[PDB]
Design a protein around this motif. Structure first.
Motif, PDB file in Angstrom:
ATOM      1  N   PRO A 182      -5.142  -0.099  31.087  1.00 40.98           N
ATOM      2  CA  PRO A 182      -6.057  -1.220  31.247  1.00 40.98           C
ATOM      3  C   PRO A 182      -7.477  -0.744  30.931  1.00 40.98           C
ATOM      4  N   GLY A 183      -8.232  -1.558  30.209  1.00 42.64           N
ATOM      5  CA  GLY A 183      -9.572  -1.142  29.770  1.00 42.64           C
ATOM      6  C   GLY A 183     -10.096  -1.990  28.629  1.00 42.64           C
ATOM      7  N   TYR A 184     -11.309  -1.667  28.189  1.00 48.28           N
ATOM      8  CA  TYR A 184     -12.092  -2.357  27.150  1.00 48.28           C
ATOM      9  C   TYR A 184     -12.042  -1.491  25.891  1.00 48.28           C
ATOM     10  N   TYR A 185     -11.704  -2.078  24.761  1.00 46.63           N
ATOM     11  CA  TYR A 185     -11.445  -1.311  23.516  1.00 46.63           C
ATOM     12  C   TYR A 185     -11.996  -2.039  22.299  1.00 46.63           C
ATOM     13  N   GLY A 186     -12.168  -1.289  21.212  1.00 52.20           N
ATOM     14  CA  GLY A 186     -12.565  -1.817  19.904  1.00 52.20           C
ATOM     15  C   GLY A 186     -11.765  -1.163  18.804  1.00 52.20           C
ATOM     16  N   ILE A 187     -11.482  -1.919  17.744  1.00 52.68           N
ATOM     17  CA  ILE A 187     -10.737  -1.368  16.579  1.00 52.68           C
ATOM     18  C   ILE A 187     -11.537  -1.627  15.323  1.00 52.68           C
ATOM     19  N   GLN A 188     -11.754  -0.576  14.546  1.00 57.11           N
ATOM     20  CA  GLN A 188     -12.618  -0.634  13.346  1.00 57.11           C
ATOM     21  C   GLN A 188     -11.984   0.175  12.219  1.00 57.11           C
ATOM     22  N   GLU A 189     -11.916  -0.425  11.039  1.00 55.09           N
ATOM     23  CA  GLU A 189     -11.728   0.265   9.749  1.00 55.09           C
ATOM     24  C   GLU A 189     -13.014   1.032   9.478  1.00 55.09           C
ATOM     25  N   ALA A 190     -12.937   2.354   9.361  1.00 55.26           N
ATOM     26  CA  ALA A 190     -14.039   3.251   8.940  1.00 55.26           C
ATOM     27  C   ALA A 190     -13.948   3.577   7.427  1.00 55.26           C
ATOM     28  N   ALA A 191     -12.751   3.509   6.844  1.00 55.83           N
ATOM     29  CA  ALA A 191     -12.523   3.735   5.400  1.00 55.83           C
ATOM     30  C   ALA A 191     -11.290   2.955   4.957  1.00 55.83           C
ATOM     31  N   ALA A 192     -11.427   2.276   3.826  1.00 56.04           N
ATOM     32  CA  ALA A 192     -10.416   1.381   3.234  1.00 56.04           C
ATOM     33  C   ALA A 192      -9.345   2.233   2.572  1.00 56.04           C
ATOM     34  N   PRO A 193      -8.145   1.670   2.291  1.00 57.08           N
ATOM     35  CA  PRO A 193      -7.185   2.358   1.423  1.00 57.08           C
ATOM     36  C   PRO A 193      -7.771   2.452   0.001  1.00 57.08           C
ATOM     37  N   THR A 194      -7.523   3.569  -0.704  1.00 53.67           N
ATOM     38  CA  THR A 194      -8.002   3.827  -2.100  1.00 53.67           C
ATOM     39  C   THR A 194      -7.775   2.549  -2.929  1.00 53.67           C
ATOM     40  N   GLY A 195      -8.866   2.033  -3.497  1.00 47.53           N
ATOM     41  CA  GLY A 195      -8.839   0.868  -4.400  1.00 47.53           C
ATOM     42  C   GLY A 195      -9.144  -0.447  -3.693  1.00 47.53           C
ATOM     43  N   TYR A 196      -9.518  -0.427  -2.400  1.00 49.29           N
ATOM     44  CA  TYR A 196      -9.825  -1.649  -1.612  1.00 49.29           C
ATOM     45  C   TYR A 196     -11.229  -1.549  -1.020  1.00 49.29           C
ATOM     46  N   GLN A 197     -11.817  -2.691  -0.668  1.00 51.90           N
ATOM     47  CA  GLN A 197     -13.182  -2.813  -0.098  1.00 51.90           C
ATOM     48  C   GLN A 197     -13.120  -2.527   1.398  1.00 51.90           C
ATOM     49  N   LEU A 198     -14.151  -1.866   1.904  1.00 51.74           N
ATOM     50  CA  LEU A 198     -14.340  -1.582   3.345  1.00 51.74           C
ATOM     51  C   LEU A 198     -14.809  -2.860   4.029  1.00 51.74           C
ATOM     52  N   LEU A 204       0.861  -1.215   0.000  1.00 51.79           N
ATOM     53  CA  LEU A 204       0.000   0.000   0.000  1.00 51.79           C
ATOM     54  C   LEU A 204       0.886   1.250   0.000  1.00 51.79           C
ATOM     55  N   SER A 205       0.539   2.226  -0.832  1.00 52.68           N
ATOM     56  CA  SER A 205       1.312   3.481  -1.017  1.00 52.68           C
ATOM     57  C   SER A 205       0.874   4.520   0.022  1.00 52.68           C
ATOM     58  N   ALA A 206       1.776   5.432   0.370  1.00 54.85           N
ATOM     59  CA  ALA A 206       1.473   6.625   1.188  1.00 54.85           C
ATOM     60  C   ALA A 206       0.079   7.184   0.844  1.00 54.85           C
ATOM     61  N   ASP A 207      -0.273   7.339  -0.445  1.00 59.80           N
ATOM     62  CA  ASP A 207      -1.498   8.064  -0.906  1.00 59.80           C
ATOM     63  C   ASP A 207      -2.745   7.208  -0.628  1.00 59.80           C
ATOM     64  N   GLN A 208      -2.617   5.890  -0.774  1.00 60.76           N
ATOM     65  CA  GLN A 208      -3.708   4.932  -0.457  1.00 60.76           C
ATOM     66  C   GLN A 208      -3.983   4.931   1.061  1.00 60.76           C
ATOM     67  N   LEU A 209      -2.950   5.032   1.899  1.00 62.47           N
ATOM     68  CA  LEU A 209      -3.086   4.991   3.376  1.00 62.47           C
ATOM     69  C   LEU A 209      -3.712   6.292   3.903  1.00 62.47           C
ATOM     70  N   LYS A 210      -3.659   7.366   3.113  1.00 63.38           N
ATOM     71  CA  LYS A 210      -4.243   8.688   3.457  1.00 63.38           C
ATOM     72  C   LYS A 210      -5.777   8.554   3.493  1.00 63.38           C
ATOM     73  N   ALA A 211      -6.321   7.914   2.459  1.00 62.03           N
ATOM     74  CA  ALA A 211      -7.776   7.661   2.319  1.00 62.03           C
ATOM     75  C   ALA A 211      -8.291   6.821   3.497  1.00 62.03           C
ATOM     76  N   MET A 212      -7.420   6.013   4.101  1.00 58.45           N
ATOM     77  CA  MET A 212      -7.747   4.965   5.095  1.00 58.45           C
ATOM     78  C   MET A 212      -7.872   5.570   6.500  1.00 58.45           C
ATOM     79  N   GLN A 213      -8.885   5.112   7.230  1.00 57.08           N
ATOM     80  CA  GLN A 213      -9.294   5.653   8.552  1.00 57.08           C
ATOM     81  C   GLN A 213      -9.616   4.433   9.419  1.00 57.08           C
ATOM     82  N   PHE A 214      -8.872   4.268  10.521  1.00 55.69           N
ATOM     83  CA  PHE A 214      -9.164   3.325  11.619  1.00 55.69           C
ATOM     84  C   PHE A 214      -9.502   4.146  12.866  1.00 55.69           C
ATOM     85  N   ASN A 215     -10.502   3.693  13.631  1.00 53.89           N
ATOM     86  CA  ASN A 215     -10.873   4.301  14.944  1.00 53.89           C
ATOM     87  C   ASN A 215     -10.628   3.274  16.060  1.00 53.89           C
ATOM     88  N   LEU A 216      -9.950   3.704  17.115  1.00 57.97           N
ATOM     89  CA  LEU A 216      -9.850   2.986  18.400  1.00 57.97           C
ATOM     90  C   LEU A 216     -10.854   3.579  19.374  1.00 57.97           C
TER      91      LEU A 216
END
Ligand SMILES: [Cl-]
Ligand SMILES: [Cl-]
Ligand SMILES: [Mg+2]
Length: 813
Positions: free
Chosen positions: A612-628, A573-585
């Motif tokens: 210490p705690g309860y957490y979740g990790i989610q892709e909110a937006a894929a890298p440009t050219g990939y499925q969410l 994955l390129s710098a520019d594709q990772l820009k489009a991409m959004q993960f939320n903790l």
């Protein structure tokens, strides 16, 4: 002159004139001395408790002191625990008034019938009594006289008594005389009255102010007395108070043959009113009357030995100054004890007391204060003083000590190192004012007070930071050290604040007592709440006290989360594709994962510190050219730093332990994964896979002016991002594809670089914007719109689903 003095300085309070116990550094004692030369020179010796020569304070004649005392301490093998010893040696007093003793000896025939050598007992008893007083060095302090009595006509002629005048028991000729006078065979009646009267007259001759004592030795039955003229009843016994020159002479019994009435109207029927009466006159005149009844027997049919005993008990000042003797040995023994009693009367220490309050900084190790004779001359256990510890004070009572008599008191104290304000390397006094009162009314004298102290030890405190690789540390951190005391409880008053510094390798040190109230090593604990340079929430702290290195280590272990992004198709994955991409903790309030408490974005390059705690990790937006893939993976950092997988938001579990690796949901052919990461399993890494979106192919068909497939025309595709690729046309209906796939959102431009030999060049720029879906595309020739089915500048566009076909017609040169 030998009143101890103390210095107070930075080192504490200790004797100005001191000595050390050989091989000990944490006790200091007061030197001995005398009233002439002052302090002795003896500054170090072994402290052996059996010693009776070193470091005594000597009162009176330095060469023969009235008493000498010593207080000293010695460390034991238990740190902070001290032996303390009090010694007191006494003496016989000098240059005081002598004692006047008259022996009054029944030399009657009655005393030469049991087969017992009573006369012999008395003679040896008296010879020994006199040499005992000489042996004790009281020869000149004791005047002895003798009155021996019988009946008129038997001893002294008409008198009925013999006498040796008072003189020094030490004088050889006085001994000759007293022993001489007793040397004859005892014979005659018992004129006890004349013995007492003449004994008293001899004690009362010289108005000396000397103690006046009379010792009567008799078998107990007077057979001669003076006529009673007047008499009194006192406590149910009749006593004659006035006598005639005429005598009652029953001879072989106390009972008068002819009883009479006196001028007081009292019935006189025996010799007892006159005998007791004369005893009373002697005592009323100040004389102390001791008596021994020797093998008392019944008076014929008249009076039991028991009633005779009761009458003899009225002769003495009190009944306990009367004794019986069953035998010759008991006679000698009685006289030897009377000699001891007179010698004891000259003691420099007589009901002496010691008051010894413990020092502020010390406690009794136990309540045992033990007493021992240690002089050349034993103090019998019946004469030993008593020693008791009550309410912070050792008290010694009833000390009786003469020549060569010495006692030692032993107790133990411990230095209290745990008291707030306690200073190590600092002398503390083991005692308050410690006093001997030698006798009632005498001025007290001061024992020298020893001092104790506890050495300092250095304790090191070390912060071991195990921060994440991306975590800056503050320059300094405030830690508070606390301690567990001997009882095992946390000292609620003692704390030591330290500033640990990056510059100093995170190591500081404090000074403290080497040992606690039980002489054992302190247990330290350490906390920081210093969050002024760093949030400590992401850190789990451990601590250890290593006793061998004297180091308390506080270990701060930081925990984090990170993710890595992969593609199912294996593309980087390129710098520019990772820009489009959004993960939320997301952080959750609890293990239900329902209420989000906090949310924040996170990138493939972040390493986020987690509490210490309860957490979740989610892709909110894929890298440009990939499925969410919008799956939310749920995890927990426990309070002990374990990682748990809690499933997805669709499927919440009670949690399984993540052991190294946890496989997650499949993404096409691959699987998402949790891995535990870091030298201390401190990082949870999500590996997230992304499936590509459909791509598009670009085909060129080349032809003539005459509709025939033309070969060897070179066309170039330039991605707006990526390398150029060049295809040469084929002389076939199928044509030639570019290898480069046109992925979603991508911007491409194509042009004919080389024209086929024989035909003209077409310099038109064809622009392809592939849509976000990667399924459709917009094409422009020369920046002008070109719909499917239409043509411009030699090019015809056909779009067949995912395949774009450009048909290019070539014109001859
Ligand atoms: Cl009376
Ligand atoms: Cl380390
Ligand atoms: Mg007799």
């Amino acid at each position: 002159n030998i009143r101890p003095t103390y210095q107070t300085d930075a080192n504490g309070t200790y004797p100005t004139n001191s000595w050390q116990v050989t091989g000990q550094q944490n006790v200091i004692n007061q030197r001995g001395g005398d009233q002439v030369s002052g302090w002795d020179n003896n500054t170090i010796w072994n402290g052996d408790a059996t010693d009776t020569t070193n470091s005594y304070l000597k009162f009176g004649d330095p060469n023969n002191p009235d008493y000498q005392i010593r207080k000293y301490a010695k460390e034991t093998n238990t740190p902070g625990l001290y032996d303390v010893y009090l010694n007191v040696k006494g003496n016989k007093q000098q240059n005081v008034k002598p004692v006047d003793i008259v022996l009054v000896v029944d030399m009657s025939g009655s005393m030469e019938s049991w087969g017992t050598n009573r006369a012999g007992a008395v003679r040896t008893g008296v010879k020994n009594f006199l040499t005992s007083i000489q042996n004790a060095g009281l020869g000149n302090y004791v005047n002895v006289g003798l009155i021996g009595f019988s009946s008129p006509g038997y001893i002294g002629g008409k008198s009925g008594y013999i006498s040796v005048k008072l003189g020094k028991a030490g004088n050889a000729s006085q001994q000759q005389a007293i022993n001489g006078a007793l040397s004859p065979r005892f014979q005659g009646g018992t004129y006890t009255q004349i013995g007492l009267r003449q004994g008293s007259a001899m004690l009362n001759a010289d108005t000396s102010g000397n103690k006046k004592m009379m010792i009567l030795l008799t078998d107990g039955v007077p057979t001669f007395s003076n006529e009673v003229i007047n008499s009194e009843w006192i406590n149910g016994t009749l006593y004659g108070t006035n006598f005639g020159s005429s005598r009652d002479e029953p001879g072989n019994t106390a009972r008068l043959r002819w009883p009479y009435t006196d001028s007081s109207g009292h019935y006189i029927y025996d010799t007892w009113p006159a005998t007791l009466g004369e005893a009373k006159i002697a005592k009323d005149s100040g004389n102390e009357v001791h008596a021994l009844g020797i093998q008392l027997a019944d008076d014929d049919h008249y009076m039991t030995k028991e009633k005779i005993r009761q009458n003899m008990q009225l002769i003495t000042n009190s009944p306990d100054l009367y004794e019986d003797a069953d035998s010759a040995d008991a006679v000698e023994a009685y006289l030897n004890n009377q000699a001891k009693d007179i010698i004891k009367n000259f003691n420099t220490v007589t009901d002496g007391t010691i008051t010894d309050p413990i020092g502020t900084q010390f406690q009794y190790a136990n309540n045992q204060a033990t007493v021992t004779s240690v002089g050349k001359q034993t103090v019998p256990a019946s004469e030993l003083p008593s020693a008791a510890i009550q309410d912070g004070q050792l008290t010694v009572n009833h000390m009786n000590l003469g020549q060569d008599q010495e006692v030692q008191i032993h107790y133990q104290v411990r230095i209290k190192t745990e008291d707030a304000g306690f200073k190590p390397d600092f002398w503390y006094q083991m005692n308050g004012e410690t006093l001997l009162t030698p006798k009632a009314g005498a001025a007290a004298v001061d024992f020298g007070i020893p001092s104790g102290r506890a050495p300092a030890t250095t304790v090191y405190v070390q912060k071991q930071w195990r921060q994440l690789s991306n975590q800056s540390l503050p320059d300094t951190l405030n830690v508070t050290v606390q301690r567990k005391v001997a009882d095992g409880s946390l000292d609620p008053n003692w704390q030591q604040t330290l500033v640990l510094k990056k510059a100093d390798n995170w190591k500081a040190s404090f000074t403290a007592p080497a040992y606690n109230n039980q002489g054992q090593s302190f247990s330290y604990v350490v906390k920081s709440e210093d969050a002024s340079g760093i949030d400590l929430s992401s850190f789990i702290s451990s601590q250890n006290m290593d006793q061998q290195t004297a180091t308390l280590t506080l270990t701060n272990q930081q925990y984090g989360f990170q993710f890595q992004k992969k593609t199912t198709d294996g593309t980087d994955l390129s710098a520019d594709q990772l820009k489009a991409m959004q993960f939320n903790l997301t952080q959750y309030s609890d293990n239900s994962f329902q209420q989000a408490s906090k949310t924040n974005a996170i990138t493939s390059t972040d390493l986020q510190a987690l509490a210490p705690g309860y957490y979740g990790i989610q892709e909110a937006a894929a890298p440009t050219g990939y499925q969410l893939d919008g799956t939310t993976y749920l995890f927990q950092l426990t309070s002990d730093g374990q990682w748990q997988y809690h499933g997805t938001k669709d499927n919440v579990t009670s949690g399984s332990v993540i052991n190294g690796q946890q496989t997650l949901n499949p993404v096409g052919d691959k699987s998402d994964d949790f891995t535990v990461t870091g030298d201390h399993q401190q990082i949870l890494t999500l590996t997230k896979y992304d499936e590509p979106k459909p791509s598009m192919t670009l085909r060129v068909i080349k032809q003539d002016n005459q509709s025939q497939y033309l070969a060897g025309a070179a066309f170039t595709l330039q991605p707006s991002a990526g390398e150029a690729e060049t295809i040469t046309s084929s002389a076939t209906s199928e044509g030639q594809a570019f290898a480069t796939k046109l992925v979603a959102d991508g911007t491409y431009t194509m042009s004919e670089t080389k024209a086929p030999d024989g035909y003209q060049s077409n310099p038109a720029k064809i622009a392809i914007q592939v849509a976000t879906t990667g399924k459709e595309a917009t094409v422009t020739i020369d920046g002008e719109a070109l719909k499917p089915g239409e043509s411009k500048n030699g090019y015809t566009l056909a779009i067949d689903g995912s395949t774009i076909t450009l048909q290019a017609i070539n014109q001859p040169l």
